[PDB]
Design a protein around this ligand. Structure first.
Ligand code: HEM
Ligand SMILES: C[As](C)(=O)[O-]
Length: 394
């Protein structure tokens, strides 16, 4: 049959893992209906999930999908995430050097500065309470990626409104309106860099496209700007929030990290394994019918790799539901796997490591200001993210 995820209510949004684990027990592939009404396939189980992410039979070119793209969706579709070789190879080569570890390490001073200033403005609240989402989890990633690509400061507020319509559309028409508004603005921002001799990443991409349209088309230029700004911000925002929630709702681990701050990098890794921002990888389409343990997914269907279930598979991560910052986290799929492995992983780790360190080093007696049952999770089956994260200190 077809399992409707919308009928499971907020209980699925708050804790989807028992539902995924129930499906993994009976097989790897399952037809489900998303809470928004889409019939997709769910791929569960760590071994199957890791394999499907790197399987060329599961394509990312929407030309291989039977699902139609709206005009607004198609306008931002020409990006590396929604591509197979050789288009994916060509597009990622354009910006790969900008996101290496050695190049991202050069941003560490500025990242620390952005974090230090946001922590200051948070600690200036008189009642000693704040929403960590609004005060640090959102401002930090959007500021870093905006300075890298050259988005003016007055333009960054509308990006939260737009991605708020992506992750949680009050009505599907609002997400479409946000996509057209973003597509129009990005085209205006691209045009504004032309001939201005800017040295930001978008200015370099505009010049690259103007010099040789075959290396980077104007649609691919728009798509590149789109994917770099959206895929960077949203996931990093939720990683900071999901991870601080994990530390504050597991006080023994917070104390262990406070005792030995060399476990910081391992704690962030387990943050990604325990409550990674990506619940399911982006849409994949089989170019031919694929047989998964007697279950045959037809060509062109929408396949969702449930990364969250892969991280709760006990044969790969023993005691999966335990948040252990000393755990062996090697081989998690939080950043994906294969040719589409997150190009922003070094930058995201740098942002998360500095943010978590600054919060703990500056604010002892930091605490969650609500009960874990009071937190609200977004009903998006693709995103594991909170509406807010109330905290208090001193
Ligand atoms: C919390 C941190 C992050 C997480 C968990 C994350 C997660 C992911 C995942 C799972 C994928 C592969 C999706 C798929 O296979 O369906 C991906 C791809 C991608 N991510 Fe991220 N990401 C993060 C940070 C970033 C940042 C900061 C940037 C931008 C600077 C970024 C840009 C991209 C791009 C461009 C791709 C497409 C790569 C390609 O197709 O080769 N990500 N990310
Ligand atoms: C800074 As603009 C894209 O509104 O010209």
């Amino acid at each position: 049959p077809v399992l409707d995820l919308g009928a499971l209510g907020q209980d699925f949004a708050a804790d989807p893992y028992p539902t995924y684990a129930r499906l993994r027990a009976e097989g790897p592939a399952h037809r489900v209906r998303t809470p928004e009404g889409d019939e997709v396939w769910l791929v569960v189980g760590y071994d199957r999930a890791r394999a499907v992410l790197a399987d060329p039979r599961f394509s990312k070119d929407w030309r291989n999908s039977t699902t139609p793209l709206t005009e607004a969706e198609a306008a931002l579709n020409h990006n590396m995430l929604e591509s197979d070789p050789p288009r994916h190879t060509r597009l990622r080569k354009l910006v790969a050097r900008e996101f290496t570890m050695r190049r991202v390490e050069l941003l560490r001073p500025r990242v620390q500065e952005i974090v230090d200033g946001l922590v200051d403005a948070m600690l200036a609240a008189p009642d000693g309470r704040a929403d960590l989402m609004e005060s640090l989890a959102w401002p930090l990633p959007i500021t870093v990626i905006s300075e890298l690509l050259g988005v003016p400061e007055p333009d960054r507020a509308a990006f939260r409104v737009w991605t708020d319509a992506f992750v949680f559309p009050d009505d599907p028409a609002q997400a479409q309106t946000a996509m057209a508004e973003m597509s129009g603005y990005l085209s205006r921002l691209i045009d504004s860099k032309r001939g201005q001799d800017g040295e930001d990443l978008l200015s370099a991409l505009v010049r690259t496209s103007d010099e040789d349209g075959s290396r980077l088309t104007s649609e691919e230029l728009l798509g590149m700007a789109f994917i770099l700004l959206v895929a960077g911000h949203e996931t990093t925002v939720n990683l900071i929030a999901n991870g601080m929630y994990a530390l504050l709702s597991h006080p023994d681990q917070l104390a262990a990290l406070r005792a030995d701050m060399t476990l910081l990098d391992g704690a962030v890794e387990e943050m990604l394994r325990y409550e990674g921002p990506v619940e399911s990888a982006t849409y994949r389409f089989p170019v031919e019918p694929v047989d998964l343990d007697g279950t045959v997914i037809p060509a062109g269907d929408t396949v969702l790799v449930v990364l969250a279930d892969a991280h709760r598979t006990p044969e790969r991560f023993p005691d999966p539901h335990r948040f252990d910052i000393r755990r062996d986290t090697a081989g998690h799929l939080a950043f994906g796997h294969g040719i589409h492995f997150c190009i922003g992983a070094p930058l995201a780790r740098l942002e998360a490591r500095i943010a978590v360190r600054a919060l703990l080093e500056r604010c002892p007696d930091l605490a969650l200001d609500v009960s874990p049952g009071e937190l609200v999770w977004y009903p998006n089956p693709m995103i594991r993210g909170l509406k807010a994260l109330p905290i208090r200190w001193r």
